[PDB]
Design a protein around this ligand. Sequence first.
Ligand SMILES: O=C1NCC[C@@H](O[C@@H]2OC[C@@H](O)[C@H](O)[C@H]2O)[C@@H]1O
Ligand SMILES: O=C1NCC[C@@H](O[C@@H]2OC[C@@H](O)[C@H](O)[C@H]2O)[C@@H]1O
Ligand code: NA
Ligand code: NA
Ligand code: NA
Ligand code: NA
Length: 301
Amino acid sequence: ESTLGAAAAQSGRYFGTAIASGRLSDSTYTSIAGREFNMVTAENEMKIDATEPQRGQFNFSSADRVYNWAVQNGKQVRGHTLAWHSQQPGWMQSLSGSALRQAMIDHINGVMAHYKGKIVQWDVVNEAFADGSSGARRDSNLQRSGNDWIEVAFRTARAADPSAKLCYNDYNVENWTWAKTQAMYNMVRDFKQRGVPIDCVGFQSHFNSGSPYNSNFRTTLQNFAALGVDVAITELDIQGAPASTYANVTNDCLAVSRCLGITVWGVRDSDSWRSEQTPLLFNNDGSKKAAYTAVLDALNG
Ligand SMILES: O=C1NCC[C@@H](O[C@@H]2OC[C@@H](O)[C@H](O)[C@H]2O)[C@@H]1O
Ligand SMILES: O=C1NCC[C@@H](O[C@@H]2OC[C@@H](O)[C@H](O)[C@H]2O)[C@@H]1O
Ligand code: NA
Ligand code: NA
Ligand code: NA
Ligand code: NA
């Protein structure tokens, strides 16, 4: 096939991107994204601040612009993200303890009701582990509400939309030897043992010199899959966009039956949150980079 999404689809997978609503008037952006991807994540518009800017007052305007663009252009949508320490609205940042717990639950219920049956995967919880050697949970208001915050978020989500695949998403969790990876593995294993609903694990895959790709990503994906979850590459970008690494990541997904697909975290390098690292598949002018060809070729076998 001649496009990433179509090539991925031949093996039953998707190839997705992050979409920014403010760029949907950019003809280069929309045409390349429309052509190349069959899955969309809202880059920012489905986060907690954007969707619930004041407590109890939902605003789906920008989120729905992304969702509607996706469906109009033949893409599925991954929902990102329901419970996260980052990009909380101020009113949520000020909450703690049981009041925060209630607000977390309320937020999940309200957002998922709006999208019930329409979103294939939700990143229910994002970025709960700390970086480094400890494997500890990240310090946040959510974590300070209790270790059970994650499980409660998942149970809430399962009740709100039984059709959605419920994903835990994180970064620095791709290298099988890292403590953070093992902390996430232990948690998912615990959840499955105890019957906490979790259907999928998302590997953000922000690869760079400090957090480099390792061939053992395949091992990580296999080992999580063996716990009885699907796996997905959710926010892929690679410092310098080397073709070799991009092919390696693609082939790791293709080698794992429960790897649903790959999303890259933007379209052109200039669209990236980390543009200075030129980490995506298209040039600033929309042309294909060497890494594009490497990914397409890998998807095509
Ligand atoms: O052990 C580590 N040493 C250096 C890199 C660091 O990972 C970084 O964590 C912050 C993220 O924003 C970066 O993308 C990531 O590389 C890692 O924990
Ligand atoms: O899950 C995530 N982790 C890191 C990238 C983040 O997306 C970025 O969030 C900050 C915004 O300023 C950027 O536009 C966005 O790319 C993602 O949600
Ligand atoms: Na094709
Ligand atoms: Na086409
Ligand atoms: Na190619
Ligand atoms: Na080939």
